[PDB]
Design a protein around this ligand. Structure first.
Ligand SMILES: CCN1C(=O)C(/C=N/c2ccnc(N(C)C3CCN(C)CC3)c2)=[SH]C/1=C(/C#N)C(=O)NCC(F)(F)F
Ligand SMILES: CCN1C(=O)C(/C=N/c2ccnc(N(C)C3CCN(C)CC3)c2)=[SH]C/1=C(/C#N)C(=O)NCC(F)(F)F
Ligand SMILES: [Cl-]
Lengths: 297, 288
């Protein structure tokens, strides 16, 4: 079933011209799209209804839209609306012209500590906004941490996200497999907000070390390592960073920092955070003083 | 830890007394040092191994030394040897007692055309030697164009330099951000020898105009201007100089002069090149 060259909203009468193909994942494909009248450019997520027949997939797509449309934050992908033809669901999102932390990681490998700190602070602020609105994302990974023109982080892909109905509620059901499986998800013990802190721990490790903490060549060994909390931080990682990784990557979810305590860690409060990163940082390491000072042009 | 007052080579048994502090950049500090027996004076580059733990920094330091120690040219900083303690790497270099073209530019701003020509010829001869030995410097800037007692140019800081392994190899990986970002570096398209001609174009512009070609108050606008080749040569620049700048500052690396063609431009062949510059030219415009 071919995807229309022009997307028409049956209700609001708005129409979009399908531009550049941006990427695909699971049931979904994503394109650059532009309004006819305003000429404003967005990201168009496009899902065939042929893949939404299995009732677990209908509820997945439904839940993503329900959660995402309720969110508005500087560090969360803007949600502009959704509509549907007889063959497709169309979701209009904020375009992020600098791809994702996944492409950055593939190109650069290990970032400098100030770059890691710059991105992680924004990831933490976004997740703090989610948790305050009782949303667990449950699938934070480099691939759904998008970058706009100015290299601001935008959290997207709410496909596994869930709303906590009361503070204290633990969930078991997932409609898919998260990239970073927290130990309480692997063990099916019930999970809450702490799974997001686990994934941010995995992300922090990956950005600073240049490889994932647990991932091996085979899933059996990966999952045994997560179960037994078997990972190693290289000697070259600065003690304060190493310390914060150890706090987040603990088997006991209750021993992990809350998202509010994460933001207040010595890593963030006492580490150099650049106000901006130059665009060259997508491809080449920037240069920083041993201890930078705001008392210098 | 603290830096030793005397530097001892464990192998060659040579020993150096740490003199005046000359300057620092990134992980490195530089001092004036003197031999015990000859009393010959050198520049001592001194890097803590504490900063070389990250394996990308170890290989950076390693590659700089590997490339630099293979070079010997009158317009390249002399490399006299290296050794290491348990806490430090020590590199013994040719001393350049008159700092760099950066300090000259800050004091003088726009140079006279014959001064610009004098420095650029030496920069081009140095780079011609590098390219012939399959070395791309990739970070030529006023700050690593050092001046000796006689204001002869010495190219140093091979920290971003790479050796071309085979004919038509294009490079992508840089272990740092060059001062002058060539458009093929910004776009991550792959680069070779032509990035050095781009940087020499930017240097020529800066020396003659007194400001950099692309640099603005915000890096976003600077990088958009490099991408779109947006720069302006003031009317007061002599046409032959203006023409040579335009040849070097082209988006297409293949459209730029090679380092060998650079030397043969009318700018060099038909312009007055002083045999030497008097020491006053560090602070006041000379008479010609
Ligand atoms: C947040 C909205 N969003 C974007 O803004 C995206 C933009 N990605 C970019 C940005 C700039 N360039 C590229 N390219 C790959 C270019 C292709 C042409 N080429 C010559 C240069 C690169 C891709 S992807 C996206 C998604 C979302 N949500 C999303 O991919 N979601 C997962 C899915 F699709 F599986 F559902
Ligand atoms: C080529 C060898 N070499 C020198 O010969 C250098 C000599 N610089 C001079 C000559 C004469 N006077 C002065 N000063 C006036 C001083 C400036 C500062 N200030 C506080 C005291 C005095 C500094 S610096 C150098 C370097 C090299 N290589 C180098 O700076 N490399 C980059 C680095 F270090 F960051 F790694
Ligand atoms: Cl992992």
């Amino acid at each position: 079933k071919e995807i229309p060259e022009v997307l028409v909203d049956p209700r609001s009468r708005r129409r979009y011209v399908r531009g550049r193909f941006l990427g695909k994942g699971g049931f979904a494909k994503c394109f650059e799209i532009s309004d006819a009248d305003t000429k404003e450019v967005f990201a168009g997520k496009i899902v065939p209804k042929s893949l939404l027949l299995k009732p677990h997939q209908r509820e997945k797509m439904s839940m993503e839209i329900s959660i995402h449309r309720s969110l508005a934050h500087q560090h969360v992908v803007g949600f502009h609306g959704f509509f549907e033809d007889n063959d497709f669901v169309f979701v209009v999102l904020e375009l992020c012209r600098r791809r994702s932390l996944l492409e950055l990681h593939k190109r650069r490998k290990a970032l400098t500590e100030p770059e890691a700190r710059y991105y992680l602070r924004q990831i933490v602020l976004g997740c703090q906004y989610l948790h305050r609105n009782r949303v667990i994302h449950r699938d934070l990974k480099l691939g759904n941490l998008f970058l706009n023109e100015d290299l601001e982080v935008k959290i997207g892909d709410f496909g596994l996200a869930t709303k906590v109905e009361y503070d204290g509620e633990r969930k078991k059901t997932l409609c898919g497999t998260p990239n970073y499986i927290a130990p309480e998800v692997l063990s099916d013990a019930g999970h809450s907000f702490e799974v997001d802190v686990w994934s941010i721990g995995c992300i922090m490790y990956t950005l600073l070390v240049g490889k994932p903490p647990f991932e091996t060549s085979c899933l059996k060994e990966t999952y045994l390592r997560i179960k037994k909390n078997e990972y190693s931080i290289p000697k070259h990682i600065n003690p304060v960073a190493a310390s914060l990784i150890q706090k987040m990557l603990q088997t006991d979810p209750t021993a992990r920092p809350t998202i509010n305590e994460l933001l207040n860690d010595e890593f963030f409060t006492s580490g150099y955070i650049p106000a901006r990163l130059p665009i060259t940082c997508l491809t080449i390491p920037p240069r920083f003083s041993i201890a930078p000072s705001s008392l210098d042009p």
